[PDB]
Amino acid sequence: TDTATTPQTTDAPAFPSNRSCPYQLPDGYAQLRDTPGPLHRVTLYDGRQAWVVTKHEAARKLLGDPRLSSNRTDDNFPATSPAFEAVRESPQAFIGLDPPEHGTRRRMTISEFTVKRIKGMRPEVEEVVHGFLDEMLAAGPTADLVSQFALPVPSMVICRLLGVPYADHEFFQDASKRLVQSTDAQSALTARNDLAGYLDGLITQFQTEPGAGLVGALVADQLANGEIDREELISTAMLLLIAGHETTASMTSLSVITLLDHPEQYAALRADRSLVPGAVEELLRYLAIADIAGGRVATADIEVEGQLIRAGEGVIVVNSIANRDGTVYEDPDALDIHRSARHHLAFGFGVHQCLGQNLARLELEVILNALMDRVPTLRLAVPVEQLVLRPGTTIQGVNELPVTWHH
């Protein structure tokens, strides 16, 4: 009987937005990047307004502010998709805890991610990388890099760290994908319960016959001392399993696409492997694949450079936009593997800064060196315009990456 007849411009754009190019900001995010001030209003999928943080130093300050809680079960935590309500209703790992509780659980896992342990993992990582490469190269002239290399490699590595038997990998890889990428709460809740039932059986097995890896250590020590609830152990292992899978696999696939679209830099990298760690840092900054890991809720009023975040408002620290802050990175939208990408926010900042960041850095270095060593002729088997990018409501990446090479 009547429709919207007036101009449709808004000062609270829909958020998140979808990438159209794997290594560029969505058009809407480039606009948010360009507007002065640390904060901007956005509209989430259900109509609720929230703040996004769009500048680098303010992103650090707010991630460091204990008044921005990580409690996903809070009624006002910003949900960016209906699938989030599964997370709001479900038990929480320490990614959803605040101090002091956050520290007591995170410290149960840190021993597996120390610089010294990551170093001792290089033989396993190199062996896993080159083994899946052996298989993919022998299996055809073309391949899907995602299912045949990008995903299995970090899956096997994190399963060894955790004590999760890789014999069950078809089951929990599928459940991990369904949980991270589901668009509705039912699909997400079902995938979470699938993983939870699997991990619960693993825990009882380790109570009968003590097991290897971090789940084995948690069952034998903290669980037996009542220091972690059985439900929390499940959530903790599940967080580590999924983060260990999906993040590195996405960085691998998107780095390959990005590097093949910048052949001069890829060639420089091939010619001087000492550049590989710096290139990994730049690709992390540039691809910034985890904006869904920026959500917070204010438990008190917070003044930010003349703007006010009110208690109970949702805040999303958008690290991809913050990593394109031209006051920190000159010419921020240019890929430069020679630049200083230090201080980037791809792993967050503060007490929740990525537990796995140095494992991810080790994996990505080994992977890039291996692809340059073993498949220097690697190229995409389809044009970039035929690839399909995941939406902005999940970890960025591609679900399929057809590639080919020289026989």
Residue ranges binding ligand HEM (CB under 6 A): 70, 94-95, 106, 158, 239-240, 243-244, 247-248, 251, 289-290, 293, 319, 346-348, 352, 354-356, 359-360
Q: In the bound complex, which residue of the shown chain has the CB atom lying closest to ligand HEM?
A: 356
Query: Does the annotation list 190 as a binding residue?
Result: no
CA 357 to chain centroid, in Å, comes to 10
When the beta carbons of 348 and 392 are compared against ligand HEM, the nearer one is 348
Q: Where are the alpha helices (DSSP H) in 209-328?
A: 213-218, 230-260, 263-271, 276-287, 319-322
Query: Does the annotation list 72 as a binding residue?
Result: no
Q: Which two tokens stand for residue 301?
A: 């009023």
Query: Does the annotation list 379 as a binding residue?
Result: no
Task: Give me the least distance between CB of 395 and ligand HEM, in Å please.
Answer: 8
When the beta carbons of 266 and 286 are compared against ligand HEM, the nearer one is 286
Query: Does the annotation list 395 as a binding residue?
Result: no
When the beta carbons of 198 and 347 are compared against ligand HEM, the nearer one is 347
Task: Give me the least distance between CB of 377 and ligand HEM, in Å please.
Answer: 26
**DSSP strands (E only) in 139-264:** 142-144
- Asked if residue 102 lies in contact with residue 94, where contact means CB atoms within 8 angstroms, the answer is yes
- Asked if residue 286 lies in contact with residue 23, where contact means CB atoms within 8 angstroms, the answer is yes
Query: Does the annotation list 106 as a binding residue?
Result: yes
Query: Does the annotation list 374 as a binding residue?
Result: no
Reference 177, options 212, 204, 150, 214; nearest CA is 150
Task: Give me the least distance between CB of 327 and ligand HEM, in Å please.
Answer: 21
Task: Give me the least distance between CB of 216 and ligand HEM, in Å please.
Answer: 16
When the beta carbons of 270 and 352 are compared against ligand HEM, the nearer one is 352
Task: Give me the least distance between CB of 55 and ligand HEM, in Å please.
Answer: 17
Task: Give me the least distance between CB of 306 and ligand HEM, in Å please.
Answer: 25
When the beta carbons of 110 and 139 are compared against ligand HEM, the nearer one is 110
When the beta carbons of 112 and 336 are compared against ligand HEM, the nearer one is 112
Query: Residue 311, by phi and psi: left (phi above 0), alpha (psi -120 to 50) or beta?
Result: beta
Query: Does the annotation list 147 as a binding residue?
Result: no
Cα–Cα distance measured from residue 261 to residue 337, given in angstroms and rounded to the nearest whole number: 13
What is the DSSP secondary-structure string of 300-344? S-EEETTEEEPTT-EEEE-HHHHTT-TTTSSSTTS--TTS--TT-
Query: Does the annotation list 296 as a binding residue?
Result: yes
Query: What does residue 398 show for φ and ψ, rounded to 5 degrees?
Result: -120, 140
Q: Which two tokens stand for residue 130?
A: 């080159």
Task: Give me the least distance between CB of 46 and ligand HEM, in Å please.
Answer: 21
When the beta carbons of 219 and 254 are compared against ligand HEM, the nearer one is 254
- Asked if residue 68 lies in contact with residue 297, where contact means CB atoms within 8 angstroms, the answer is yes
Q: What share of the chain is helix, strand, coil (3-state, %, to 5)?
A: 50, 10, 40
Binding site for calciol: what residues are annotated? 80, 192, 235, 292
Task: Pick out the residues of the known binding site for heme.
Answer: 102, 106, 296, 352, 354
